[PDB]
Subunit: 115 residues, 4 copies
Amino acid sequence: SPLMVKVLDAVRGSPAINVAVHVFRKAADDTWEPFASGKTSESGELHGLTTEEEFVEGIYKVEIDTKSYWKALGISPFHEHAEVVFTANDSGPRRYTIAALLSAYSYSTTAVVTN
Amino acid sequence: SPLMVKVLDAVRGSPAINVAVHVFRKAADDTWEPFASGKTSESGELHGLTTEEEFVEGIYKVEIDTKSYWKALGISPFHEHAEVVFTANDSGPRRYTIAALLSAYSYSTTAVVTN
Amino acid sequence: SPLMVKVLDAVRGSPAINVAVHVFRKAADDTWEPFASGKTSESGELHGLTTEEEFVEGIYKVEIDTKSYWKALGISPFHEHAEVVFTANDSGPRRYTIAALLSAYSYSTTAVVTN
Amino acid sequence: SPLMVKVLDAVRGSPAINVAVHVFRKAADDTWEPFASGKTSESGELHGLTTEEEFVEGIYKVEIDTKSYWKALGISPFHEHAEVVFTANDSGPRRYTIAALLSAYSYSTTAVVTN
Ligand SMILES: [Cl-]
Ligand SMILES: [Cl-]
Ligand SMILES: [Cl-]
Ligand SMILES: [Cl-]
């Protein structure tokens, strides 16, 4: 997959397991099409999201459903979810990894772009 | 204002000055109404966004327009913007501060809820 | 004070109140002298740490005692403390703000350097 | 290795490659013994740091030498280094992963503790 997502838990110090993740592509015009989705594994990683064939240039939104993750662990968190929005360019990097770190009232995300 | 937003710059180590910020409220149903907006000051803070009269319970989205901030500083960043989405509850805290820390390929946000 | 420290709590979504903070200066040579210290206020901020007279060039260590903060709130955290180490240059910025965001298993810090 | 360290770069959006990492153990008493060290690989990961035989209970310091990393990439950063200090307990988790995310004026670290 040219797009991978990895999620960590900063409250419990663990991979974020079984987190739902949705990818949308901005169709032109001008709304968010469901593009790909899945749930993180025991390592907190979500593999096989998409393929080079399906992953074309465009604006993508990665929605990590942090709210249900926390409730399943006994926590009612601040955020509804975590969102990451970016443009995929073919001149850009071949592989994108979206990494997220979750707390009850905070989150950080970073993009790791490689070849 | 019961809602304040503060933005820092982790690449240059400065307040994020003149960043555009938009707040939307999820109207029922089921879209994002423009609710309030403004630009951060020299301290990277955005004051007077709204009032207790206008700020009712609901789901709010705070969109920080990180892309134009970075381009104005000579940087073409990864993210289109930074988004923070949360529910305001009247049983909840009287004041919400959304703090964001921006990098070219990363951002973190935290909510500071006080009385 | 040319040095200020501000600490936030990402688990509870609050300023980090009454956190002990120690500043050391690397004496030449080659150990850490106690330079200044204090406890954050209700806003999570530590003001009046030092003065322009006392704050000379050198290597400084800011130790935030995150462990006792968390235990006082009923949490046994991962880290012993949070440390930030940097060089103050007179050609550099007049004011340094060290901002920290604490979780049970994580912390981030950023330096905000201004005039 | 029961201890692994992974480092990401938030300015360039890449694994942090060839970063020097030092682990010290607080000998009793009361100083920091060199315990283990190495340099991150192309994935930004540092494997084979130590073994279950050598990794006993105690207080450990992980020093990531962020300054030379940045200079090698043409950047003069704020921090001298990134430090992470924690207690290893045998009742604790079998494996510790220290993850760090670096910017010029900021860093975050998180501990991922697993079995
Ligand atoms: Cl709910
Ligand atoms: Cl563009
Ligand atoms: Cl203890
Ligand atoms: Cl130097």
